Amino acid sequence: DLASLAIYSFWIFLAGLIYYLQTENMREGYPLENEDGTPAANQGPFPLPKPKTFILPHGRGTLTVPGPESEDRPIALARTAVSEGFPHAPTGDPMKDGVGPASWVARRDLPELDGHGHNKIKPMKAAAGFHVSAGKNPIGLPVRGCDLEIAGKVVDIWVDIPEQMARFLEVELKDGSTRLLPMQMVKVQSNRVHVNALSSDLFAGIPTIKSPTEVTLLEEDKICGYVAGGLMYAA
């Protein structure tokens, strides 16, 4: 019967489609590893996908995935049990060391470029036209931590230019240097910006950027990872 043949065929295709979809989804992170970093005997029933390449714009090279993978950063944790399945505990200061929910990835130490090849994220001070067009403007407001003390004042917004969105508040500290604070980790209020993740004295340890007008993908991850990490490690 043709309806019968169609539903039976469709189920064969869907098995095919799922298997294809699972292998596509194994382009990062696989092969699986034991907790000592050696590959795992068991890798599941789906084969690793054959490599694919992306040509990056703006002379930035190419990425091939899957491919030999490496944290190229040291990881300050130690195993907690002889057998697998247990937590690995920070050996050091997990916020300075970038582990657990303070983790950052070794992304390229180059800023994300827009379609024209210009830095995608720039402080309002370096981006013509841009301005708070609605809601409470944070600039010059005091930045307050979960300890309820003041860490600094907002001296700028770092803006995703193409998207026209506020990505970071730049906050000036006692010693007159500054740090980026992700917008999604701040509650802009009437009288203050409140940062629940960090106490006022953990702002100075936010990783610093190499340039006063640009932020690299590597710095963004260090910064965002550090700030998210405070929710656990400053509690």
């Binding site: 990062e28 992170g29 696989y30 092969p31 699986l32 590893e33 034991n34 907790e35 970093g37 795992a40 068991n42 890798q43 992306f54 040509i55 990056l56 714009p57 993978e69 944290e71 990881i75 944790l77 907690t80 697998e84 399945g85 247990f86 937590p87 690995h88 505990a89 920070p90 997990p94 970038g98 582990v99 657990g100 929910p101 303070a102 983790s103 990835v105 470029l113 827009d114 379609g115 024209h116 193409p162 998207e163 969105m165 999604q184 998210a228 990490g229 929710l231 656990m232």
Partner: protein, 281 residues
């Protein structure tokens, strides 16, 4: 076994209950107290479904059907074989679903991410609870809930829908459907857009997010943006399910008639109600 980048994330912490006592993984799966709770509830609910299937005398999953109590039982407990297995299974399902959500919360905490996911899953849990708990309670009987059977629950949808005429006329069902159709449209477009940029024409470098905005702007005159499309997908699918729950909560509780009658707040309005002509004149 671990993803190649995973180990730096497997730290102690984030638990809501139990401290470090359930703070461990089984294979890929995080456990936690709510992971053992899900296990206890899921295990017992499945055991009772198997018992119910022995009581029915079939092992074919196309045939197994666990029915709620007869309507005469109202809201009281029923004997196992006469609706009690349903009621205990419903309690196990609820605890498993809520426990799954609380475990997601622990996982969010250990990873340092927002709680959007368990919060989004609560809408699905609230819709299941609408059908199996809130609505039956408001109507005064557990027999109003749906049976736990592959095809029998579809007979329940049909029986319940037809009871109110064409359910299509329920206006909160109309809003829910529009959300569901709009959600799939937005999902198709979002996957397409990102993939059409990451995988551009042959002989081209990877497109940037500006190409995605340009493309949508060329097509339609507006681009919601990368952050907006994810807010939008969440809003559409959650609103679909909110309006689903709403369209059932009002059905047989504040609404008892054929749903097509509701529409008279318009047709029979006293001024134009009487004009000769059209479809109702």
């Amino acid at each position: 076994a671990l993803l190649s980048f995973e180990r730096k994330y497997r730290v102690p912490g984030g638990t809501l209950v139990g401290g470090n006592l359930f703070d461990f993984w089984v294979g890929p799966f995080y456990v936690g107290f709510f992971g053992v709770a899900t296990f206890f509830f899921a295990a017992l609910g499945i055991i009772l479904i198997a018992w119910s299937a022995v009581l029915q005398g079939t092992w074919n999953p196309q045939l197994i059907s666990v029915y709620p109590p007869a309507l005469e039982y109202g809201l009281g407990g029923a004997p196992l074989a006469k609706g009690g297995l349903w009621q205990i299974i419903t309690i196990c399902a609820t605890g498993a679903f809520v426990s799954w959500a609380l475990r997601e919360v622990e996982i969010c905490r250990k990873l340092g991410i927002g709680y959007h996911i368990p919060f989004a899953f609560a809408f699905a849990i609230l819709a299941y609870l609408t059908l199996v708990l809130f609505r039956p309670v408001m109507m005064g009987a557990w027999g109003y809930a749906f049976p736990y059977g592959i095809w029998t629950h579809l007979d329940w949808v049909s029986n319940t829908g037809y009871t109110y005429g064409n359910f299509h006329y329920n206006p909160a069902h109309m809003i829910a459907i529009s959300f569901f159709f709009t959600n799939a449209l937005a999902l198709a477009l979002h996957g397409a857009l990102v993939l059409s940029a990451a995988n551009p024409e042959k002989g081209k470098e990877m497109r940037t997010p500006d190409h995605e905005d340009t493309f949508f702007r060329d097509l339609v005159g507006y681009s919601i943006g990368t952050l907006g499309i994810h807010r939008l997908g969440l809003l559409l699918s959650l609103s679909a399910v909110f309006f689903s729950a709403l369209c059932m909560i009002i059905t047989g509780t504040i609404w008892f008639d054929q749903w097509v009658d509701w529409w008279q707040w318009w047709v029979k309005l006293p001024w134009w109600a009487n004009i000769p002509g059209g479809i109702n004149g």
